Design a protein around this motif. Sequence first.
Motif, PDB file in Angstrom:
ATOM      1  N   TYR A 236      10.620 -16.422 -10.876  1.00  0.00           N
ATOM      2  CA  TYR A 236       9.892 -15.266 -10.364  1.00  0.00           C
ATOM      3  C   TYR A 236       9.769 -15.326  -8.848  1.00  0.00           C
ATOM      4  N   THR A 237       9.988 -14.187  -8.197  1.00  0.00           N
ATOM      5  CA  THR A 237       9.812 -14.074  -6.753  1.00  0.00           C
ATOM      6  C   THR A 237       8.691 -13.077  -6.462  1.00  0.00           C
ATOM      7  N   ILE A 238       7.586 -13.586  -5.924  1.00  0.00           N
ATOM      8  CA  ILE A 238       6.405 -12.769  -5.651  1.00  0.00           C
ATOM      9  C   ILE A 238       6.171 -12.648  -4.147  1.00  0.00           C
ATOM     10  N   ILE A 239       6.195 -11.413  -3.650  1.00  0.00           N
ATOM     11  CA  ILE A 239       5.904 -11.135  -2.245  1.00  0.00           C
ATOM     12  C   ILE A 239       4.653 -10.256  -2.130  1.00  0.00           C
ATOM     13  N   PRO A 240       3.505 -10.875  -1.787  1.00  0.00           N
ATOM     14  CA  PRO A 240       2.260 -10.146  -1.541  1.00  0.00           C
ATOM     15  C   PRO A 240       2.358  -9.248  -0.310  1.00  0.00           C
ATOM     16  N   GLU A 241       1.958  -7.991  -0.474  1.00  0.00           N
ATOM     17  CA  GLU A 241       2.010  -7.000   0.596  1.00  0.00           C
ATOM     18  C   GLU A 241       0.605  -6.536   0.963  1.00  0.00           C
ATOM     19  N   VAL A 242       0.397  -6.248   2.245  1.00  0.00           N
ATOM     20  CA  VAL A 242      -0.871  -5.692   2.714  1.00  0.00           C
ATOM     21  C   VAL A 242      -0.641  -4.493   3.640  1.00  0.00           C
ATOM     22  N   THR A 243      -1.266  -3.371   3.294  1.00  0.00           N
ATOM     23  CA  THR A 243      -1.207  -2.161   4.107  1.00  0.00           C
ATOM     24  C   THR A 243      -2.625  -1.811   4.547  1.00  0.00           C
ATOM     25  N   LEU A 244      -2.801  -1.597   5.848  1.00  0.00           N
ATOM     26  CA  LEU A 244      -4.127  -1.367   6.419  1.00  0.00           C
ATOM     27  C   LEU A 244      -4.230  -0.024   7.134  1.00  0.00           C
ATOM     28  N   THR A 245      -5.402   0.598   7.034  1.00  0.00           N
ATOM     29  CA  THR A 245      -5.682   1.860   7.716  1.00  0.00           C
ATOM     30  C   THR A 245      -5.926   1.640   9.209  1.00  0.00           C
ATOM     31  N   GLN A 246      -6.471   0.472   9.546  1.00  0.00           N
ATOM     32  CA  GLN A 246      -6.754   0.106  10.933  1.00  0.00           C
ATOM     33  C   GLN A 246      -6.122  -1.240  11.287  1.00  0.00           C
ATOM     34  N   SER A 247      -5.655  -1.359  12.529  1.00  0.00           N
ATOM     35  CA  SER A 247      -5.075  -2.606  13.030  1.00  0.00           C
ATOM     36  C   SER A 247      -6.172  -3.617  13.357  1.00  0.00           C
TER      37      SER A 247
END
Length: 95
Positions: free
Chosen positions: A15-26
């Motif tokens: 299994y290859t797991i890549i956690p992603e994070v998307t933010l409204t503010q920097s």
Amino acid sequence: SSQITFNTTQQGDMYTIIPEVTLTQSXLXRVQILSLREGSSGQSQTKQEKTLSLPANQPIALTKLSLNISPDDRVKIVVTVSDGQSLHLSQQWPP
């Protein structure tokens, strides 16, 4: 609507797991990643933290985790993203 998502692929039992994070503010954010695998003949646990600057409106790949998961293997990936102020995001894989 800032969130943590998990991008996953599978090859047999790899299994290859890549956690992603998307933010409204920097932010200057503290990123914590706890990974745990409990197999039949072996166990493995990784605790990793990193304080870095994240941009807004873009999905950022935090890490690449390759895990050998077989039937009845206990697997857990907990990702925590916090700016030190009002943002605290925590998501766990498997969902």
